[PDB]
Amino acid sequence: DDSLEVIARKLNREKELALEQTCALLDYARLQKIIEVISKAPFIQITGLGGSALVGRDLSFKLMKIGYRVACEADTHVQATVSQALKKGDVQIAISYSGSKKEIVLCAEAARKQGATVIAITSLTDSPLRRLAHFTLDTVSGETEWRSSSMSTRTAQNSVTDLLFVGLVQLNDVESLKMIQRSSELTQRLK
Amino acid sequence: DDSLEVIARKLNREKELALEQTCALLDYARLQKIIEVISKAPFIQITGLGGSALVGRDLSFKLMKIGYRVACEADTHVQATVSQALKKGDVQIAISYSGSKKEIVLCAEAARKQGATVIAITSLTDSPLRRLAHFTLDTVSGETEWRSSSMSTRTAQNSVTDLLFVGLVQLNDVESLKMIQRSSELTQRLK
Amino acid sequence: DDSLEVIARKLNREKELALEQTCALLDYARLQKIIEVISKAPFIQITGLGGSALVGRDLSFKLMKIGYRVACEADTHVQATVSQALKKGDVQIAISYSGSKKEIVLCAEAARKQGATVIAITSLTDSPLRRLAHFTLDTVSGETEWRSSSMSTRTAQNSVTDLLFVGLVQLNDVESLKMIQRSSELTQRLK
Amino acid sequence: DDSLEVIARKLNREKELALEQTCALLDYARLQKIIEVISKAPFIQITGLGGSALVGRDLSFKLMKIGYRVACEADTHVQATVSQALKKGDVQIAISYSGSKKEIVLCAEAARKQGATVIAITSLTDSPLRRLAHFTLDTVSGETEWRSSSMSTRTAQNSVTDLLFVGLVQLNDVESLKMIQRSSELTQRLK
Ligand SMILES: CC(=O)N[C@@H]1[C@@H](O[C@H](C)C(=O)O)[C@H](O)[C@@H](COP(=O)(O)O)O[C@H]1O
Ligand SMILES: CC(=O)N[C@@H]1[C@@H](O[C@H](C)C(=O)O)[C@H](O)[C@@H](COP(=O)(O)O)O[C@H]1O
Ligand SMILES: CC(=O)N[C@@H]1[C@@H](O[C@H](C)C(=O)O)[C@H](O)[C@@H](COP(=O)(O)O)O[C@H]1O
Ligand SMILES: CC(=O)N[C@@H]1[C@@H](O[C@H](C)C(=O)O)[C@H](O)[C@@H](COP(=O)(O)O)O[C@H]1O
């Protein structure tokens, strides 16, 4: 039976398992440290390709709304130019499930060479990106069916980036709320 | 207690409830019809703003990989120009949780005027977009905490678009698999 | 003397020379043929990276407004997935000054393998892209100063894409004017 | 006679006149001041829609390569969220030929309210954007034919942004050259 109802049920369970297995690997003390490192960055570059780039863009819009200076761009050659322009104290959040896309590895190498802090969000595998990162947060898609592998992967990745966002709101709550209110007031003027 | 572990646990449950409540509203017979309508479209425009635009882009990349001709662009004025260029038999997938963003409503009005079929992916509310759509698929975020409302909304929206994608693969399985293989072979050449 | 007034004067002359030298190479009979080929394409993919991707996007928005079904995306891995999904009769407009960016060459190889027609917009050099293209339109930046090389290159590239756009309007003038009017009416509703 | 050769000749002359008429309005002392203001900005937001957004993106990529922290995004609601997050000393470069697109005016109002410096790049008309800007740089398309109005407008706009870029390179030449070299070395590794 391959009805749409069966497909939906199996996909929801697949996503639940990705959330659970990703959450199970978190070191919460290490996560609080990473959040503090991000909060101090004068500039944050979020890198990625394909589905990882969309996860990165999703995080980037939220961070920009609450006042962070963020670079996040799909063009891989532009991404490389930003990575080499990073400074000590800046942060790169490198989102790559495989950790082995040449463009993203190159951006991480360039960021690290400039003295920036590299935080990888990547699968539980021994990848070039994991070897370059100062800190790694793990994303586990679980055992997925081929038609939905990319969707459960994205679900797992968003569980990590979403938690980073909430942690950053927690650290600067008053200003975050002020910026959320100003943003809502502005977009309502476009109704 | 507002520790990161508590936050992660509550957020995962919030997402689970969004998946469940969205799934509970599906009319599977109506969904199969919508999938067939999409499969026949010579051109598909996926519209949206903000987080909905990212959900749309996520679907657009998958549909393009399996051979669909898709327009999906963030610039709202460009979106309007595409909507008025649609033809009878083309499909607009209008993604808007509120269903009341002026730009997205305008695009749906323009598409409908040209004779295109409008499928709305929207919250369970009485919005201008829902009144313009030929078919509506409901997305329910559930009762969310303010720090994560947009994330659970996105989770609910992706549950609908992901199901559309799997349904479309199901309808043209051989060609979808061929295109997935060619795509994987090409990107591996960029390693 | 390196005053801003001197810089502006020299840059305008550099752009004038790029327009002139690019125009001087055009075979107008071959250009009319290319325009006809584009006009018949059920789907057009415009590829490119960096500055060439922006030139491509600029053309893509105009073509979409006048009714063409166009793919144009910065992410190089997404571009590859679109190229392998092209069909016989579809057209790829491959914009690359060097003609030797691996990602763009790969997209042209994939498009040609599927039977699509490849039109390269590229410098007057013996590049892999020029060897893969069914038709090539030349772009000459001229001898440029290092601070403005990319700007005069873009000027030369836009001179070719702009001419393609005008030629396509010429071929379907009534419908183009109708679509321009509908588009203007819609965007004015967002004032 | 409406041959492609005649069209190309007329379009090149139209672009030459746009460059000339835009250049003729520059106050070079005021321009040097604007360049200095930009050079000191901890964060720069470049706003715009449609063709102006592409001009902005073109400038943004160059500024990011030479070390500036820049926001530049097509989604108008995201643009609004960035504008309200700007700080005193930050700069908004608001690119709008008409100066009367509601979204761009709103972003300029929000930036000014936060204490940021607003530099408008706009036509020689009495627009809401010109009334909000601390400094305005004029862009003149000249008298254009309807098929090419947007192209000559873009040419005029790029003449201003290109001059800003060269002026900024001039102010920090050693670091700009270092960043250009690192960027070229990195992208060559992707060949
Ligand atoms: C054809 C292919 O395989 N494209 C992949 C992307 O997969 C997408 C979801 C897909 O399957 O259509 C992947 O998101 C991206 C980043 O991958 P990663 O850095 O997250 O490991 O790389 C690309 O080559
Ligand atoms: C400041 C604001 O409210 N921006 C909203 C977007 O919310 C985002 C996630 C946010 O909160 O930062 C919303 O995704 C978009 C489409 O909304 P919708 O069409 O899905 O209802 O509209 C925008 O105005
Ligand atoms: C650091 C570098 O060199 N980036 C280049 C891009 O140059 C841009 C304008 C630049 O200088 O910052 C180039 O537009 C793109 C496509 O090049 P092409 O396909 O048009 O030849 O390739 C990228 O690697
Ligand atoms: C249908 C329409 O008119 N779209 C316009 C855009 O024109 C484009 C080039 C076009 O004609 O297709 C314009 O670039 C943008 C910003 O305009 P501006 O802020 O530079 O004045 O506004 C949009 O509404």
Shortest-distance Cα residue to atom 5 of ligand 2: B50
Residue A28 exposed, middle or buried by CB count within 10 Å (0-12, 13-18, 19+): middle
Tokens at residue A178, please? 């002020």
A74 contacts in chain C (CB < 8 Å): 73-75
Resolution (angstroms) equals 1.2
Rg (CA), chain A: 17
- DSSP one-letter code for C163: H
Which domains does chain A possess?
4-189 (3.40.50.10490)
- DSSP one-letter code for D42: S
Among chain B residues, the shortest Cα distance to D77 is held by B50
Tell me which chains share at least 3 CB pairs under 8 Å with chain A: B, C, D
A69 contacts in chain D (CB < 8 Å): 42-43, 69, 71
Rg (CA), chain D: 17
C74 contacts in chain A (CB < 8 Å): 73-75
B183 contacts in chain C (CB < 8 Å): 80-81, 84
Dihedral angle, C-alpha A18, A19, A25, A30, nearest 10 ° = 140
Taking the C-alpha atoms of residue B83 and residue C65, their distance in angstroms, rounded to an integer, is 9
C65 contacts in chain B (CB < 8 Å): 81-82, 85
H-helix or E-strand containing D146? none
Which of D46, D49, D105 is the pocket-test mutation for ligand 4 (most atoms within 8 Å of CB)?
D49
Provide the CB-side half-sphere exposure for D147 (13 A, CA).
21
How far apart are the CA of A122 and the nearest CA of chain B, in angstroms?
17
How far apart are the CA of D59 and the nearest CA of chain C, in angstroms?
10
Residue D172 exposed, middle or buried by CB count within 10 Å (0-12, 13-18, 19+): middle
Give the Å distance between the CA of B184 and the centre of ligand 1: 8
Beta bridge partners of A47: A94
Query: What is the side-by-side order of every strand in the sheet holding C117-122?
Result: C70-71, C44-47, C91-95, C117-122, C135-138
Give the Å distance between the CA of C1 and the centre of ligand 3: 29
The partner residue sitting opposite A148, judged by closest CB among B58, B155, B162, is: B162
Taking the C-alpha atoms of residue C7 and residue C191, their distance in angstroms, rounded to an integer, is 37
Residue A119 exposed, middle or buried by CB count within 10 Å (0-12, 13-18, 19+): buried
Taking the C-alpha atoms of residue B141 and residue D191, their distance in angstroms, rounded to an integer, is 45
Taking the C-alpha atoms of residue D76 and residue D101, their distance in angstroms, rounded to an integer, is 11
- DSSP one-letter code for A167: H
Shortest-distance Cα residue to atom 6 of ligand 1: A50
The experimental method behind these coordinates is X-ray
Tell me which chains share at least 3 CB pairs under 8 Å with chain D: A, B, C
Check if the beta carbon of residue D86 is closer than 8 Å to that of residue D43. Answer: yes
Query: Is B76 in Cβ contact with C85 (below 8 Å)?
Result: no
Q: Within 10 Å of residue A124's Cβ, how many Cβ atoms?
A: 15
Residues 6+ apart with CB under 8 A from D58: C51, C54, C154, D158, D161
Rg (CA), chain C: 17
- Answer yes or no: is the C-beta of D50 below 6 A from any ligand 4 atom: yes
Tokens at residue D178, please? 């270092």
Position D166, amino acid: V
Provide the CB-side half-sphere exposure for B151 (13 A, CA).
29
Q: Is the dihedral of CA A140, A144, A147, A152 positive or negative?
A: negative
Query: Is A80 in Cβ contact with D183 (below 8 Å)?
Result: yes
Give the Å distance between the CA of A52 and the centre of ligand 1: 8
Give the Å distance between the CA of D156 and the centre of ligand 4: 15
Check if the beta carbon of residue C66 is closer than 8 Å to that of residue C172. Answer: yes
